[PDB]
Amino acid sequence: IHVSVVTPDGPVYEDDVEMVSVKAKSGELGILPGHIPLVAPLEISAARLKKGGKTQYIAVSGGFLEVRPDKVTILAQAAERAEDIDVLRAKAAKERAERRLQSQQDDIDFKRAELALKRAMNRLSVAEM
Template sequence: MNTIALDIVTPNGTVFHDDECEIVVVNSVQGELGIMAGHVPVVAALKIGVLRAKINGVTEMFAVTDGFCEIRPNKVTAFVQAAEFAKDIDTERAMEARDRAEALLQKLQDERVDDFEARTALLRATNRLNVAKGK
């Protein structure tokens, strides 16, 4: 079976690399995108979500923030602000972040709070929890 390389890169450096991915699935702003070896070159904007990579029959899951990915026939490079392995997500910390974001959204009615920032924080926390649970 042909494989494709995957790099997940954050501002702090490479978080993940593997040369033997059977398929990589990303959440682009236009929908879910499955990428296999030989894919046509594309640059796609990514939204907060899960990035999945099937390697030797096992699916690895990562919680990623927004960014973009460069797709070439033999390699996918995801450039994101942050990425975490599903198994490394501290679910207690993510639940606390979700609760803080929800409380911040509740304050919107009473105070001037950055709506976009609050909604993005809630989306990130919820995504981390979903990825940690394997969703």
């Protein structure tokens, strides 16, 4: 039935699939349309789902599953599509360099603008009139 995975950064995947299988911390689970309302946390694992025309590849980190007979959703703090947990950690590590570079650039732009403003104000002040 309808499935969707979302993250605090935003939605990731959205489609209607009649078979989804996930690994919960207490054991394996499998969901089909008309399933009873069930809540279970998910550890670091794939989100193997079948009937999307072909076996679709979704992997999540810090997952949390909530199921409705007509709606399926899982909440993940991080998600990717290669299903290789090494790829997930690789992406997480690679994002750190981008974050540092972005923070440094944001700081330097403001510093340059502030220097320009300081010089202009100093010129205005020394022109006391």
